[PDB]
């Protein structure tokens, strides 16, 4: 079974930069590879055939290189919609098989997180659980920490994230951290703390409230 | 108008069986090879089965082999996988992709693909909680917990309202149940002036709920 990997796995780029993504595969495969993008809740989308064919429809910045066992995917001048991940595949022999993916991502400025804390609705605390949201809004880069203080104790296996997929219109990504307790849990303390440590903040930054 | 379109996914057993079908629109299935690529959560695209233009052959991964069967039915114009004895790991998006040795030998036509999941919970619709705003500019949104299988569709304000709302990828809590929250930014001055519901949707269970967030009491 011929085996595709793709380098690298992740990238960040700019708007307008040259971007090239690598595939080798285990064995020579003539020129049968080809190349497709793939969006979030998407099926992939051939890009290049045979190598180095552009398929019919796709924008002329798309090119593909290479031969036997190192191919090469360029893009020319990245454009806002060209974030996706992109997966190179081997179609010499059966079965065909896929490079793990390289997922492109949009390069930009630092940005803080707004920072905002939900208690636990009266509707919710009647079935015994008790759900806290922390929220982190439209921030950049991904990589972020986030703290549950509970009455002053650090929390360790109960919480849990979220993070949005990259942004339409800013490239920001958002985030949830929620932790959850039993209702008795919740009514035997106080202070309910989110601690935020992000690039984008000058110090971290806590959002409580009192129960 | 050529096109491939797939229905069939859905919540089964461990050991169960589910068939998957793949309609062609404008091109006859029987002059293709039909492959079947499948997409477990976050990871790959990985081959699974392959059937050969006219019928001709059948190709499966070890994974999978001597479990599912391709075939087609030519009249229907409709190409099939069918999976036996089911396992976890076989819970994947699904996609039929159509395929030559002639030129361009690559995957051009795809279908969309359908969840299959694999699990001993039974179907559950999500309970639905409000995100009242604390206390510029601030938030508020919905907690969407304890829900079986995916997905669940959220909106706002009966789709008149999409700036800045972020719809969270959802977890899967160790009780086995998922659970996600839709949340929204809005200016505080049209807020106790213009009222807010969320409208989630969990097909599955034929759950629809529609939320009217409003602020707390203390």
């Known amino acids: 079974d011929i085996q595709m990997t793709q380098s690298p796995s992740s990238l960040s780029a700019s708007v307008g930069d040259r971007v090239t993504i690598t595939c080798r595969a285990s064995?020579?495969?003539?020129?049968?590879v080809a190349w497709y993008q793939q969006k979030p809740g998407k099926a992939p989308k051939l890009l290049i055939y045979?190598?180095?064919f552009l398929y019919s429809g796709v924008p002329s910045r798309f090119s593909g290189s290479g031969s036997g066992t190192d191919f090469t995917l360029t893009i020319s001048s990245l454009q806002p919609e060209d974030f996706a991940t992109y997966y190179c595949?081997?179609?010499?022999?059966?079965?065909?098989?896929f490079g793990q993916g390289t997922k492109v991502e949009i390069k930009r400025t630092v940005a803080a997180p707004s920072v905002f804390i939900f208690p636990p609705s009266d509707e919710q605390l009647k079935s015994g659980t008790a759900s806290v949201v922390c929220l982190l809004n439209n921030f950049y880069p991904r990589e972020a920490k986030v703290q549950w203080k509970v009455d002053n104790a650090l929390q360790s296996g109960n919480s849990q994230e979220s993070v949005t997929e990259q942004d339409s219109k800013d490239s920001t990504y958002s985030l949830s951290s929620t932790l959850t307790l039993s209702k008795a849990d919740y009514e035997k303390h106080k202070v309910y703390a989110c601690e935020v440590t992000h690039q984008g903040l000058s110090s971290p930054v806590t959002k409580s409230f009192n129960r | 108008e050529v096109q491939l379109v797939e229905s069939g996914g859905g919540l089964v057993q461990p050991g169960g069986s589910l068939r998957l079908s793949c309609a062609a629109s404008g091109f006859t299935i029987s002059d293709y090879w039909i492959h079947w690529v499948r997409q477990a959560p976050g990871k790959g695209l990985e081959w699974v089965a392959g059937?050969?233009?006219?019928?001709?052959?059948?190709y499966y991964a070890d994974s999978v082999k001597g479990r599912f069967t391709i075939s087609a039915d030519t009249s229907k114009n409709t190409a099939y996988l069918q999976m036996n004895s089911l396992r976890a790991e076989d819970t994947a998006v699904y996609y039929c992709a159509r395929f030559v040795f002639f030129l361009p030998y690559a995957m051009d036509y795809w279908g969309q693909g359908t969840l299959v999941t694999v699990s001993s919970a039974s179907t559950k619709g999500p309970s639905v909680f409000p995100l009242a705003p604390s206390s510029g500019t601030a938030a508020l949104g919905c907690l969407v917990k304890d829900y079986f299988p995916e997905p669940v569709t959220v909106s706002w304000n009966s789709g008149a309202l999409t700036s800045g709302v972020h719809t969270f990828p959802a977890v899967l809590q160790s009780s086995g149940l998922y659970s996600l929250s839709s949340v929204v930014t809005v200016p505080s001055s049209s807020l106790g002036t213009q009222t807010y519901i969320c409208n989630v949707n969990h097909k599955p269970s034929n759950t629809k709920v529609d939320k009217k967030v409003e602020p707390k009491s203390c």
């Open positions: 595949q081997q179609s010499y022999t059966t079965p065909p098989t």
């Open positions: 064995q020579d495969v003539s020129t049968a």
């Open positions: 059937i050969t233009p006219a019928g001709g052959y059948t």
């Open positions: 045979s190598a180095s």
